[PDB]
């Protein structure tokens, strides 16, 4: 994906993180586990919700077929009528199917973006303090305890 | 000691499409296309449709004797009519500007039928002998119930001069007709006079109908033809008839009252004893989806119709294997 | 010592929408929808419209006596006509294929009226007595100015045989009519002959009109009816009339000269003494915006009409609080 | 935003930079101030101008309603006529509103992209020379004077 | 020692457009618009079109003597007709509901002409004298080949009573006409009777035509007029004629057999002796492109028509200088 | 471009790499040359192929003009007929031209993305081992031989 994080340098997702869409796994002497990053997850929930509502709504004014009848010697206007109704139904079908295709691709990339931005935010903090492993993980030069871990998550390291 | 950034996976099997990739499995997705209906014709918003079944709009309005089910029908939400209804135009002919009438009906929810010219109002003409075996009722030659087939009395058809005034505040659908016999002697037998006319006038109508004789195929055991005309008579307007024969005179006409949103659906389905907020010719729709793919012609609060087999939005992220 | 990368903010309050977010404040933005008009009907590109005001296209073309304002009108840019003009069809009737004519007019900027049959050309018929109180002028029974209501002379209506040849190089709009009396004796009083016809032919026309008698409502204190017909007579073609009564004969017909781009606007607005490059039925547009939301029907160099309340493009970046 | 710079790791914009869309703030012993990066700003001005013209232009051929009249017994074709005109006006309204929505989102992301690319271009040069602060800023290990600062801007550090 | 990441360049000159930038040179690109045709009218999928050349659909169906090329034509794929064909309606008039017929033809690939009323079937009427110098064949006054101009015999036009039954299983296009003379004495000379009619009936038709006399311009040296009518006669249905003059009687009528997909193209091009899978009025298309910009009206397996001058997709990357 | 690699920090492409769309140039004592990265190139070939087919296909149901004729006194319906046919042909022309414009821009950015992701994948591996030159290139602190180079390409450095 465009941002290279999802199924990119981060090989796969976490069945064990049910808490939210993105976050951290930590692992030290006291143990290990998952913690959803609440705000980036919330930003993403907002984005996607607004998008869907935009999508639904933009499509609410849209061609309505009206039943209309013609006699045996009105074949030209009957056909015109038919070609017209079908014509709009095809335009709207295309509008709808494409909007879905494009926005689906934009949604997936958005998630990738949010993961990468989160990754970078943590990378920025660690500095020379940790070895960037290449896989989404940072291995500390020294001894990170649970409140050390918490400090990374909370945004107040060092 | 180690901290990692990562993202959600789950057991989800839901797939979405993109431009560059098809069937991408995602953690969450929103389907937005309604694919289901109940396959019934239902009341709309409580209000039952007019279901003609066999009868056509013509068979109904003129009062085909087999269409007695519809002598007096309540406010309807929509009208349903089969593709090829059997009970219409029992005595063969035409219905003038039928489609423009059907169209007028689409913006009408209630008719109230009132007598404009009484059958027992014809002093000089025979008004109980205008019947045909093409229009049987309970085994006996009968005729369209709302019009009167006027016929010669004591061997005379005196020039008719009749005129109805619309004192009602509601618009009135007045229907009449003309009989086209198949030869010279039939004219004689029925009306006496050999050359005739029906003249009809309102404030905007200027009509003069003259019977067309021709020999033609026996549709319903009949070579004669009826041709039916209609007008909409405004309030405080009068309709003036003048004829010396071949006249199919109004008995009843319909007050146009309700003027509701409405359609004539083509469907071979019968009433299903249900209620809905959105009806299609194939069945009703109960859904909160923005779109449906059921049928283009709907009535009610409906989703938007599209031709798709599938509309699914990704909401979650690419689910990992 | 320190160097930073950063971006612009300003005091801008302008907001744009996106799919995922609404009302994003941006540093710069371009509005592309014109929301404003001047609420006037104006000259287009210098050239004044034909503003009928009360008169209808019918009232104008036939020459309704109350439509003298329009006896001879210059090249117009567009035509304006009210929803329900009072001055049309002063003597009640119909105007045959009126809408096809209105349509022909939309591709016409200039008419030049010329006399084709002179009033003082009728030797055998009374041509100054064809008047009605339905069409008053300065208090006196008058009539459509461009046609002549031919009437019996010394108690005779000799068969008329008149024929005009289009020697002009410009197409000609010829108009005529037929009177439909309301009873047998009126025919007698006006024309003598009881059964009549008007036959009209050109190279492509093959017409025969026959008066329809019927008793009908007094529209404008009148039960009689006029019915008006028209043709377009090509260059080097002739129009041949033949009638023994009920004939409303041409006096004048219009040369079609300019053939400009044009429309008939429906508007209850009067002339505003302004000039514009783009006119709508609601007012004129002076704008460089690509779009406007004023009214769908425009004429001129116009922006594209859309139904939006708002079209704003981001040009700058997300403005920071 | 997708590129994480604007209202991302760079908390907010600069009221004090009127010179252009993106650039630098510097701060040393000789003083401090803003300097617009002329070329990335110009690239962006081009992009946005072309876009608007593309947008306006793509929309120039577009359904024009033609006034058309029908008698009392031509109700079916009058309605057809109406449903047709309305139908196109709805298609074009949707086309226009959506194009605006999507491109607005693309424009904002473009600016984010340009900021991030500028940031990275500077990051590349500094190397071990400066501490990457996390906020858009680089703090020098040694003593950067005004021509040292200029050298970063101009693209010729070290 | 050094390792670098990088991307492809090549000598490519192909450019694509984007929203923000025009003419971006790319390494690879796919053109998807077909701009080329062969400028010929060709057989479609082996099956040759009906190319009328000069003749009109009218000139062909009625059997204009100059349209002998088309007396009996095979199954065609499509029909080509010039903008203003010379050989149609040799004797001036009208063709009733011509466009509805043209439309019916668009869903028809094969006609088979059969005799319904034999010329040597008229006992009481002269059937070899109904000719005109307006319709010459090899220098001699002739007439539409498929209809018969019935004329008085020994100074009498007995009332015709003729009737054809459609025993064929295929629908039948029956054509007939009426002559409109230009004065009273012409009626006398041709038919004897002064007032006439043609009545036509089927199971659904109820017609009565009455000749219209008028003096009119000499189109093709003729002031008389012919007016042609048609019907589609179902299987097991009969068509009943009755007339005492002015009758243009069927000799031949067409069995409708094939009922293929088809169109009438307007083109001034002649046959090109080629085969194609997709034909336009300007030339044929042989292409695998999804789109073409040649002409909107096509028949066959065709690309989608768009108005573009250029449709090119980037596939490769921005090519470097 | 959005990802800053193509005609970004990587000044221009490689006439000498005919093997594929993206890859490596190496240069040491044993010599030098180009090697296409087979999988990122293949991922890109798939993406673009699917896109084109999506694009072609989405456009396959689309308004077909039907020849239709009208007499001299049917001018209103003739015009309606014309305005209808033209109206759809304009809607589809716009649909087609815009889809091309937008997707062209998305395709170019996709290539940029793929280059940047490849760059980052290599950057991740090198660590303190090589000097990131700023231009797409990494200069080794020590002595990289052909199988050392191969190890970088293959994804198994160190």
Author numbering:
A (entry chain F), D (entry chain F), F (entry chain F): 1 to 158
B (entry chain E), C (entry chain E), E (entry chain E): 5 to 325
What did the study's authors say about this model?
However, a prerequisite for efficient transmission of avian viruses between humans is a change from preferential recognition by the virus hemagglutinin (HA) of α2-3-sialyl-galactose-terminating host cell receptors, predominant in avian respiratory and gastrointestinal epithelia, to those terminating in α2-6-sialyl-galactose, which predominate in the human upper respiratory tract. Thus to better understand the nature and significance of such adaptive changes, it is essential to monitor HA changes that may affect receptor specificity of avian influenza viruses, particularly during human infection. A single amino acid difference was observed in the HA of each egg-grown virus: Asp186Glu in A/Vietnam/CL1/2004, Val134Ala in A/Vietnam/CL105/2005, and Phe151Leu in A/Vietnam/CL2009C/2005 (H5 numbering). The effects of the single amino acid substitutions in the HA on receptor binding were also studied by X-ray crystallography of HAs in complex with pentasaccharides possessing terminal sialic acid (Sia) linked to galactose (Gal) by either α2-3 (LSTa) or α2-6 (LSTc) linkage.
